[PDB]
Amino acid sequence: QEQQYDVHGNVISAAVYQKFHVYGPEDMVFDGDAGGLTIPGAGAFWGTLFTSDLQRLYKDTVSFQYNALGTYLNINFFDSSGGFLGHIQAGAVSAVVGVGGGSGSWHNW
């Protein structure tokens, strides 16, 4: 069974880059950058982090992919080999559609 944790965060998007910020358990925060094409905008989201190994998620995440599906947001986390480390399911205040991803990592705050 994967462990479940409350998370919350924000996405801010320019036209060609975006930043994702997620507050997780154990006083850790995820910052990720994605580039490509988006509609400029921003919003908050709240949800659940699912992972079978939180320590490994925080140590080994170097990448994220996301799927924005209206007021649903899915964020998947990966290590440098493309291995899946866990994911977030969240509700987003601001409806957005798109898929993308990029570099990111977890750190203390």
Author numbering: 86 to 194
Task: Provide text from the study.
Virulence-associated proteins (Vaps) contribute to the virulence of the pathogen Rhodococcus equi, but their mode of action has remained elusive. All Vaps share a conserved core of about 105 amino acids that folds into a compact eight-stranded antiparallel β-barrel with a unique topology. At the top of the barrel, four loops connect the eight β-strands. The same applies to virulence-associated protein B (VapB), which is also encoded on a virulence plasmid; this plasmid is mostly absent from foal isolates and is predominantly found in porcine R. equi isolates.
Here, we determined the structure of the protease-resistant VapB core in a new crystal form with two molecules in the asymmetric unit. The crystals diffracted to 1.71 Å resolution and the structure was solved by molecular replacement. The same three residues (Asn152, Asn159 and Asn161) from both chains contribute to nitrate binding. In one of them, the loop regions at the top of the barrel adopt a different conformation from other Vap structures. An all-against-all analysis of the available Vap structures using the DALI server revealed that with regard to these loops, chain A of our new VapB structure is most distant from the other Vap structures. Okoko and coworkers suggested that Vap proteins may have functions that only manifest upon the conformational changes that frequently accompany the binding of small molecules to proteins. Our new VapB structure reveals that despite the crossover connections, VapB can form a large cavity between the β3–β4 loop and the β7–β8 loop. The bottom of the large VapB cavity is formed by hydrophobic residues (Val96, Phe105, Phe130, Ala153, Leu158 and Ala177), while its side and mouth contain both hydrophobic (for example Ile124 and Val181) and polar (for example Ser98, Gln103, Thr123, Tyr151 and Ser179) residues. The large cavity in VapB contains 12 ordered water molecules (A311, A314, A320, A322, A332, A344, A357, A360, A380, A390, A401 and A403), giving a hint on the size and shape of a putative ligand.
